[PDB]
Ligand binder design. Sequence first.
Ligand SMILES: *[C@@H]1O[C@H](CO[C@H]2O[C@@H](C)[C@@H](O)[C@@H](O)[C@@H]2O)[C@@H](O[C@@H]2O[C@H](CO)[C@@H](O[C@@H]3O[C@H](CO[C@H]4O[C@H](CO)[C@@H](O)[C@H](O)[C@@H]4O[C@H]4O[C@H](CO)[C@@H](O[C@@H]5O[C@H](CO)[C@H](O)[C@H](O)[C@H]5O)[C@H](O)[C@H]4NC(C)=O)[C@@H](O)[C@H](O[C@@H]4O[C@H](CO)[C@@H](O)[C@H](O)[C@@H]4O[C@@H]4O[C@H](CO)[C@@H](O)[C@H](O)[C@H]4NC(C)=O)[C@@H]3O)[C@H](O)[C@H]2NC(C)=O)[C@H](O)[C@H]1NC(C)=O
Ligand SMILES: *[C@@H]1O[C@H](CO)[C@@H](O[C@@H]2O[C@H](CO)[C@@H](O[C@@H]3O[C@H](CO[C@H]4O[C@H](CO)[C@@H](O)[C@H](O)[C@@H]4O[C@H]4O[C@H](CO)[C@@H](O[C@@H]5O[C@H](CO)[C@H](O)[C@H](O)[C@H]5O)[C@H](O)[C@H]4NC(C)=O)[C@@H](O)[C@H](O[C@@H]4O[C@H](CO)[C@@H](O)[C@H](O)[C@@H]4O)[C@@H]3O)[C@H](O)[C@H]2NC(C)=O)[C@H](O)[C@H]1NC(C)=O
Lengths: 208, 208
Amino acid sequence: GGPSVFLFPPKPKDTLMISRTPEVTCVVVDVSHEDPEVKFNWYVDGVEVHNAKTKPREEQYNSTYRVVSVLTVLHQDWLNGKEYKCKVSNKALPAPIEKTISKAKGQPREPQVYTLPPSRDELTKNQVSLTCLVKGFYPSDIAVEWESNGQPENNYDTTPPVLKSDGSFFLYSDLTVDKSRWQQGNVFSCSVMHEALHNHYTQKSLSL
Amino acid sequence: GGPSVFLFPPKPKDTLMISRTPEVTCVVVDVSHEDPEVKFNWYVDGVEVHNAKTKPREEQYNSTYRVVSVLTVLHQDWLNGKEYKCKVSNKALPAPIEKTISKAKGQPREPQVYTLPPSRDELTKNQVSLTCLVKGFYPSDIAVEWESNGQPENNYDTTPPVLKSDGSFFLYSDLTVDKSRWQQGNVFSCSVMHEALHNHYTQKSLSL
Ligand SMILES: *[C@@H]1O[C@H](CO[C@H]2O[C@@H](C)[C@@H](O)[C@@H](O)[C@@H]2O)[C@@H](O[C@@H]2O[C@H](CO)[C@@H](O[C@@H]3O[C@H](CO[C@H]4O[C@H](CO)[C@@H](O)[C@H](O)[C@@H]4O[C@H]4O[C@H](CO)[C@@H](O[C@@H]5O[C@H](CO)[C@H](O)[C@H](O)[C@H]5O)[C@H](O)[C@H]4NC(C)=O)[C@@H](O)[C@H](O[C@@H]4O[C@H](CO)[C@@H](O)[C@H](O)[C@@H]4O[C@@H]4O[C@H](CO)[C@@H](O)[C@H](O)[C@H]4NC(C)=O)[C@@H]3O)[C@H](O)[C@H]2NC(C)=O)[C@H](O)[C@H]1NC(C)=O
Ligand SMILES: *[C@@H]1O[C@H](CO)[C@@H](O[C@@H]2O[C@H](CO)[C@@H](O[C@@H]3O[C@H](CO[C@H]4O[C@H](CO)[C@@H](O)[C@H](O)[C@@H]4O[C@H]4O[C@H](CO)[C@@H](O[C@@H]5O[C@H](CO)[C@H](O)[C@H](O)[C@H]5O)[C@H](O)[C@H]4NC(C)=O)[C@@H](O)[C@H](O[C@@H]4O[C@H](CO)[C@@H](O)[C@H](O)[C@@H]4O)[C@@H]3O)[C@H](O)[C@H]2NC(C)=O)[C@H](O)[C@H]1NC(C)=O
């Protein structure tokens, strides 16, 4: 009996691209159908902010409501480790609940990006696998794409980051392409977006 | 206030190997220090088998004990998809708690195993990454290890399966070894165990 608060970070790709909207999301569950009103107060670094958008209530199968408020964050402030505080208040709730999240603490470290050509054994099939290995980056927030001839490349699949024993992360991306295109020596390119890279961006090409 | 039950499947290698004993493990946490008695009832496909092993209670640091009951499963009884049930009873627990797991149904599919030598740009560091790409298998249950000269290597990290859009799974394994051992021509090997492979087993050797 009593509302509970969970505060979630922006998505990594949203934080690293100027055209997307990173946002912190304050979720409140277990709010009574009796008292269904919640008030949110948001503090960036202490300083209160007023442009947060609240969404409408939606009742769960639990017969309790879930109410959410999302706050847009400035790319830079997130990057520079500013604290985003969510205070919630409900009348079926004795004292306000506060939560604070932020960029992952710790020394950022630059990823190494390697491109691996298809295995000789895969040079059997109509389609081959182009591999991008991204290892040794901190924090785990990152974004990987593929391109060729200045155009995006659609069917790649990327693994989630995996924490290596030294405290950094690695992942792999697999872009599968028609072997006709690979055998022509067309140049494919693995794009990596990460806070620790110069201008937050690096490319690594692959062909022969 | 109140116990909780979590029920986990066997280790994928244990189900695939004639010489291993897969088990289903039913864990109970948040048990009372005043009421430490828990009884288990194990339902295979409905019918009762009574051979399950109950581990003694172990006290956690949050002052609540830890009850484990494990039941060995016959290999094809899991692989054909028969459901395993763990009902848990406790005096500080009003109505019993049931849990059920089973093999993920769907037509199994043979994993492709391709091995990729180090990137050229990594042949300058003292440590090198050997890469096993395992793609196109269903379901996600799989075991991946590494050998060299027939002897197992341990310093690797495997990603968890990732779902492709066609409905299958792929992963990568990153075996790290000193380049002195790569440039000497040692024959490294990544082993993949899966129900859809012939013999539940396959290996790919890589060197030059
Ligand atoms: C009544 O039902 C409610 C839920 O509805 C249920 O309806 C019934 C009928 C069934 O169908 C249910 O299955 C159904 O869910 C219950 O609410 C739930 O409460 C529990 C606990 O009370 C919550 O569990 C927590 O879960 C979070 C993870 O949240 C994500 O979980 C799932 C996916 O797995 C998802 O459904 C959920 O919504 C969250 O996913 C998504 O959340 C955001 C959605 O807005 C996404 O944010 C994104 O933001 C970007 C911004 O750029 C973009 O905008 C994206 O579009 C946007 O979506 C987010 O990415 C997304 N993620 C995923 C994966 O989908 C856990 O993290 C919680 O953390 C733990 O908390 C406990 C303490 O309670 C600790 O023991 C843990 O260690 C951990 O907390 C640690 O300690 C402190 C906190 O104490 C932290 O500071 C530490 O950092 C923590 N440590 C670590 C290592 O993290 C927790 O487990 C559950 O989410 C609720 N369900 C919701 C909200 O839908 C009610 O409880 C229930 N009432 C009763 C009385 O039972
Ligand atoms: C006092 O402290 C205790 C412990 O400190 C608290 O208990 C914890 O409660 C948590 C929630 O109440 C519970 O979280 C749940 O976690 C599981 C994941 O389980 C693994 O989690 C840990 C690793 O990340 C590990 O410590 C666990 O033991 C589990 O790992 C292992 O489990 C089995 C152990 O026997 C293994 O089975 C293996 O079986 C083969 C058989 O062939 C073989 O025999 C092998 O040797 C066996 O070990 C697993 O393989 C092994 N796995 C690994 C990776 O090591 C999640 O899956 C749960 O599911 C979630 O439930 C949520 C709702 O409850 C839901 O929101 C979500 O979507 C998902 O469904 C859940 O998160 C935690 O596990 C538990 N700790 C335990 C049991 O040790 C206790 O709460 C606390 N008391 C108070 C009060 O705070």
